[PDB]
């Protein structure tokens, strides 16, 4: 079936770097892009950036601009995204979505997601 | 070490033992036992202060060609022991002066 | 032994006609196309394509030069050509014509810079399918074409070694000459003229007043990076980042490294590989550069 | 217009210190580079070493690495300092100038360039032989 698994991730210290993951399965893993969003507890969502399969070329915003690292392993059809040099208001959770069914042949929007994970940090233990 | 005998009145050429790869820069000097060594020749083509203008030096132009100094009308004074020394870009820094060559005149 | 690189000397095993003898062969290597075994730490090295794919060789005796190529249609379709010097991309034209068929075609591959191609008139065009999303590459075209002189000033050699019965094998023998890396030279006023250009017409997409920046690739591989194309024999790729380095608001020509690679992997697939013999001599590439894609 | 005069001991016990200053006379240093010669009798020129205004002290890979340059600008003099000497190393020491030039054959912005050396003014040199006795 068309979903997308993650993995969670436990609490990091300051200053830190992040490993995030996104599984794909079923459709075909390098004919769309794949963009990756974050929420905030308690406020609205906010876009990061997207990145395309096929040939690895990748565009982000500029909130992120020169902290955030997207790769990606298309012989296991499998993402990562780094992030290091963290903050405290960094405390949210990470998605990746996919626009693998419409019948408008824009980018945008997309409509399947998938399981989601919260990542927070901690100054001290 | 290599000997040379060429009377008065003939024209020689001494070339450098060790060859060259790539772009090149050579040096001349010559040495008198007893006396200061002196250079002949530098960058190829340029001529010093102090010199017969006899010595013809060898362009290096369309790499491929060799280092050779000649020389053109031989005098008592030019009968010494001569040193090359050679720059290139794919050796790096040299060091030693390798082999020299003596040149001895008859009559 | 260059003292403190891009080439390696590497010698190994290679079989001969007969089934028994085994000959020891030399050959240069780029040193893009090797990726090291041990890692602990010693050298000992390998080829990269063959991990996961097979490689197969080109034998020189057909060409990549790009020809022209009409594509022509069969007896009961036609054609229909537009004439019009403002096609913004979509919609009506008031001028049609009706050809037989085309003009020639020139099946060149390149990648952040078209080369080559059509030259605009009276103007330069900027196309796109939605401009108010990112999430489609913008095309533009020039209505004067950029010179460009690509060279590699070594001197390689051929060095053709037995492998088996009735077959061949190429290598870089040996680099006789001067180490030097392949460059490429850009006019720059022209560039400058050109961008200014380019940057005027599209200030009418977004407001009459706006700041216009320009940064090199975001990065993350070796083909959709730098500027890739192929010329002479033998496949480029050329850093780009001297060029989209400006800010707009309101006789010493440019140089661009290069670096060369021989084990590709075009036409992204999966078990196939294409290895490339060297050309011999020097090359030497002029080119009208004319487009430009920009997210 | 620069001329060198070199004094030397001559006559020294194995392993002790030698040196051999070249005192100069002429125009003052600003740019131009100082080395050092030596040469054995049945051997050719050894260049053991140039000094620079930057502290460099490189020299030949096989000569040990056991002798040491010096300039001091209060008396304007230069001198070397060679430890554990052998008998066998009898020879004559020219103190001379040199001067560096570049050569060009690639671009610039590469790197694509090498330097090289050229004594031009030399000096008289002397001969120091050292021995147990
Ligand atoms: C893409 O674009 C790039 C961008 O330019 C191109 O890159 C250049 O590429 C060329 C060739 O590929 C390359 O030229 C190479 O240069 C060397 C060195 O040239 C220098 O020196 C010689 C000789 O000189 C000395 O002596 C004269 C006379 O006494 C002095 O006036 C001079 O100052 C020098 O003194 C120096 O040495 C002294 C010791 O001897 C020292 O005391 C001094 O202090 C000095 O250091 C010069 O002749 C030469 O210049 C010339 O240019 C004139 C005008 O055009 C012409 O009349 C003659 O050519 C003249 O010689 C230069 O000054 C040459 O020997 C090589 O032959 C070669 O030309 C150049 O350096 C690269 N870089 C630049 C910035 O240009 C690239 O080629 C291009 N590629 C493609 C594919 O398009
Ligand atoms: C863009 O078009 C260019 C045509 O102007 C083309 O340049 C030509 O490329 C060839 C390929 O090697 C060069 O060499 C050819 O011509 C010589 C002439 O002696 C032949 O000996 C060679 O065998 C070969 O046919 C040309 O010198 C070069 N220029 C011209 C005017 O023909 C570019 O290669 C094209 N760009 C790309 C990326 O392919
Ligand atoms: C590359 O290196 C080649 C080998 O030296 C050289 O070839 C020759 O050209 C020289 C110069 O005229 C001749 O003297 C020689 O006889 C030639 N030999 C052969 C076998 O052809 C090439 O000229 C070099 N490449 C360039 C561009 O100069
Ligand atoms: C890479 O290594 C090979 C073998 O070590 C080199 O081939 C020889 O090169 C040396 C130069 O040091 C010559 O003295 C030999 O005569 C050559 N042949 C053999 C059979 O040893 C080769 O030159 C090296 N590559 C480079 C670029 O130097
Ligand atoms: C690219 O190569 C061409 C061909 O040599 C260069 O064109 C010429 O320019 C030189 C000096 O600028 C003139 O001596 C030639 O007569 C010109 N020939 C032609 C056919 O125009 C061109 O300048 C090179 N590009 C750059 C940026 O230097
Ligand atoms: C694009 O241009 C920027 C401009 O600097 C390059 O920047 C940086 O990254 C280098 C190595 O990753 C660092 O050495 C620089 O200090 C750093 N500079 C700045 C201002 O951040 C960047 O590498 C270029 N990207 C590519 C792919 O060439
Ligand atoms: C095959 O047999 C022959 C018999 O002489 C022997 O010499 C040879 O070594 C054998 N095969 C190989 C390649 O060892
Ligand atoms: C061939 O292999 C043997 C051992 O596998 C090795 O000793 C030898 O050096 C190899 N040949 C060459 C030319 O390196
Ligand atoms: C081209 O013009 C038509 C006419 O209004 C417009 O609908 C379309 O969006 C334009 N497209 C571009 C890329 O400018
Ligand atoms: C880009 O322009 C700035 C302007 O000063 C310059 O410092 C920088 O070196 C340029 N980058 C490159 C890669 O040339
Ligand atoms: C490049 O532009 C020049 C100038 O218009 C033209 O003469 C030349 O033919 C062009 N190159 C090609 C391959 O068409």
């Known amino acids: 079936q068309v979903q997308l698994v993650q993995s969670g991730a436990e609490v990091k210290k300051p200053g830190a770097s992040v490993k995030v993951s996104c599984k794909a399965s079923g459709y075909t893993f390098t004919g769309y892009y794949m963009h990756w969003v974050r929420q905030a507890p308690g406020q609205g969502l906010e876009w990061m950036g997207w990145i395309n399969p096929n040939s690895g070329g990748t565009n982000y915003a500029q909130k992120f601009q020169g902290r955030v690292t997207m790769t990606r392993d298309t012989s296991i059809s499998t993402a990562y995204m780094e992030l290091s040099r963290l903050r405290s208001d960094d405390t949210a959770v990470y998605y990746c979505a996919t626009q693998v069914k419409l019948d408008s042949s824009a980018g945008y929007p997309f409509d399947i997601w998938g399981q989601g994970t919260m990542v927070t940090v901690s100054s001290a233990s | 070490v290599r000997p040379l005998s060429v009377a008065l009145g003939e024209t020689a050429r001494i070339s450098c033992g060790r060859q060259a790869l790539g772009s090149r820069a050579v040096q001349w000097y010559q040495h008198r036992p007893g006396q200061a060594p002196i250079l002949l020749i530098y960058n190829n083509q340029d001529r010093p202060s102090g010199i017969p203008e006899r010595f013809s030096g060898t362009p290096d132009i369309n790499f491929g060609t060799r280092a050779t100094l000649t020389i053109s009308g031989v005098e008592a004074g030019d009968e010494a022991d001569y040193y090359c020394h050679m720059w290139d870009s794919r050796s790096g820094f040299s060091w030693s002066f390798g082999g020299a060559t003596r040149l001895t005149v008859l009559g | 032994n260059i003292t403190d690189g891009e080439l390696k000397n590497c010698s190994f095993n290679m079989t001969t006609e007969l089934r028994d003898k085994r000959q020891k062969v030399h050959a240069l290597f780029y040193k893009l196309d090797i990726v090291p075994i041990n890692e602990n730490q010693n050298t000992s090295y390998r080829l990269i394509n063959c991990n996961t794919a097979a490689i197969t060789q080109a034998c020189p005796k057909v060409s990549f030069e790009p020809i022209p190529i009409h594509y022509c249609a069969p007896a009961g379709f036609a054609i229909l050509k537009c004439k019009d010097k403002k096609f913004n991309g979509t919609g009506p034209c008031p001028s049609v014509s009706t050809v037989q068929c085309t003009h020639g075609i020139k099946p060149v591959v390149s990648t952040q810079l078209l080369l080559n191609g059509s030259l605009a008139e009276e103007e330069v065009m900027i196309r796109s399918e939605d401009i108010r999303n990112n999430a489609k590459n913008i095309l533009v075209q020039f209505n004067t074409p950029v010179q460009i002189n690509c060279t590699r000033p070594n001197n390689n050699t051929r060095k053709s070694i037995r492998i088996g019965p009735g077959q061949w094998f190429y290598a870089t023998g040996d680099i006789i000459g001067d180490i030097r890396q392949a460059h490429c030279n850009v006019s720059k006023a022209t560039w400058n003229e050109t961008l200014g250009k380019v940057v005027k017409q599209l200030r009418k997409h977004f407001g009459n007043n706006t700041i216009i920046r320009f940064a090199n690739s975001s990065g993350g591989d070796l083909e959709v990076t730098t500027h890739s194309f192929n010329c002479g024999g033998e496949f480029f790729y050329c850093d780009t980042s001297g060029l989209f380095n400006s800010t707009w608001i309101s006789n010493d020509s440019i140089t661009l490294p290069c670096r060369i690679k021989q084990i590709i992997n075009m036409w992204q697939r999966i078990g196939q590989a294409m290895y490339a013999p060297p050309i011999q001599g020097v090359i030497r590439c002029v080119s009208n550069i004319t487009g430009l894609i920009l997210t | 217009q620069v001329q060198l005069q070199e004094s030397g001991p001559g006559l020294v016990k194995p392993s002790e210190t030698l040196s051999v200053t070249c005192s100069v006379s002429?125009?003052?240093?600003?740019?131009?580079?100082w080395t050092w010669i030596r040469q054995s009798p049945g051997k050719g020129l050894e260049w053991i070493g140039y000094?620079?205004?930057?502290?460099?002290?490189t020299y030949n890979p096989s000569l040990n690495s056991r002798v040491v340059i010096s300039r001091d600008t209060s008396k304007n003099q230069l001198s070397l300092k060679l430890n554990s000497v052998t008998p066998a190393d009898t020879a004559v020491y020219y103190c001379?100038?040199?001067?560096?030039?570049?050569?060009?054959?690639?671009?610039?912005?590469?790197?694509?360039?090498?330097?090289?050396?050229?004594?031009?003014?030399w000096g008289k040199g002397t001969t120091v032989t050292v021995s147990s006795a």
């Open positions: 002429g125009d003052s240093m600003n740019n131009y580079y």
């Open positions: 001379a100038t040199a001067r560096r030039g570049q050569r060009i054959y690639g671009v610039v912005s590469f790197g694509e360039f090498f330097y090289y050396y050229s004594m031009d003014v």
């Open positions: 000094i620079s205004d930057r502290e460099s002290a």
